């Protein structure tokens, strides 16, 4: 199991210890308050108002907590998942990642506590 | 497991099939977007910037998810509860509940989707 | 989780501290080495070619690992039990008891060593 | 999650689906009557007052229950394992094996019925 803070200034995402293996169930709970720029914050959800510019994820508000499965493209997290299989073929470290445009992370603040655990299979 | 959805302007609660039972752990992931008036939504966490103007849950955000265990008071759960046990004392049916005050449910709007799991214990 | 030592002259049984509830699921493991009376000792299967002489439980063999939940009848447990479910209607504390006739206690040895805990569910 | 038979008289063992991976926390149970040649069966744990005359593990009865990691060396299994995690380094998939001398697996007979899951970790 893993618990760390994903910072929204960390453009590189957050590595954690979690390694999915096919057949993995997992459960992922996020909290807390960051922003991509503006002084107010938002939470796991990112901001439902704030167009799309070209964000690392298209599947998530910008401000969102999204992650990547080795290589993978860009997973939502939001919130978290509940006892969660991820899609065929898809297998590696977890990097928890604030959903941004590439080269806007430097005015970011704020970060989102995090658990990671692996369930029953 | 159970999943469903709590909507905002249901001030009596969702009930759900979750029965706590002393030593139980469990987790909880709440998603989703809704209103205690206004026109903007807030996700699970609430408005951290509205003050409390008498909520059912005086620990938890104005618009943040909170429940009741039995007949117990509000507890917190805003995103979810991470292999969670309950207080001392706390044993019944989890019903999910919207945090406003009594008497002013009908202008809200939106609803969490919510899944709640029983752990390994 | 309740991990302890199920002794073979134990008439009355081990009360563990597991409560078991309705929708719970159990994995049960048992190990060792018992007698009801002979010199040789068996597993938690119990001695296959044993006649029953009016055993706690006719559903396993002499010397078996069994159980009762709250006021239930006997239950094999024998090595154990994977991601387990019981009758409907069957609930309250797991008694755990080794199989022989009912007065006949006071000349058997060894014990089994068990551990039980609750699955996801 | 994995359920099948080990046959007694398969020197080579059965492969099962379960891939232990780094980290993973495993519970095995084991149930059943072998026999190594003899007309008695034992359960899992195998015979106790047999010398060891070559068993492909030194570290259990034989007849017992075994398995092997990837190409790890044997392994006792006996009636299980309880939310067990293996050495550092061993890894791959999990063969379950009848602990017999090589070579003198014609004359066995029975089997065991086993289960594997992966737990919370
Ligand atoms: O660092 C910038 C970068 O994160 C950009 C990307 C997310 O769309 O959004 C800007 O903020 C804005 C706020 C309101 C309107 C337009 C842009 C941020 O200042
Ligand atoms: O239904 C009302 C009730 O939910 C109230 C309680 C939560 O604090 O908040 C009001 O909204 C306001 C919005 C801005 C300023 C003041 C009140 C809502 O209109
Ligand atoms: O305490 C007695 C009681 O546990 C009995 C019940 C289980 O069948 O088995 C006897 O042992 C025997 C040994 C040899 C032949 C017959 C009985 C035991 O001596
Ligand atoms: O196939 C032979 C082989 O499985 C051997 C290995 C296990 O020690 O045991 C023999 O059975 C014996 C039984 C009693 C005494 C000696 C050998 C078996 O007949
Ligand atoms: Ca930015
Ligand atoms: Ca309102
Ligand atoms: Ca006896
Ligand atoms: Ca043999």
Redesign the interface.
């Known amino acids: 199991?893993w618990k760390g803070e994903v910072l929204a200034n960390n453009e590189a995402g957050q590595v954690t210890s979690i390694?999915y293996?096919?057949?993995?169930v997992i459960?992922?709970?996020?909290?807390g308050?960051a922003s991509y720029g503006p002084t107010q914050?938002?939470?796991?959800?990112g901001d439902?108002?704030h167009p799309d510019q070209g964000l690392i994820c298209h599947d998530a508000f910008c401000g969102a907590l999204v992650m990547k499965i080795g290589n993978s493209g860009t997973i939502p997290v939001?919130?978290?998942?509940?006892?969660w299989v991820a899609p065929n073929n898809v297998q590696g470290a977890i990097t928890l990642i604030y959903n941004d445009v590439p080269g806007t992370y430097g005015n970011n603040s704020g970060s989102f506590s995090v658990?990671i655990?692996?369930?029953?299979?």
């Open positions: 199991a390694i293996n096919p057949g993995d459960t992922i709970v996020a909290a308050w914050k938002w939470g796991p959800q439902r108002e939001n919130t978290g998942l509940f006892r658990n655990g692996k369930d029953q299979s």
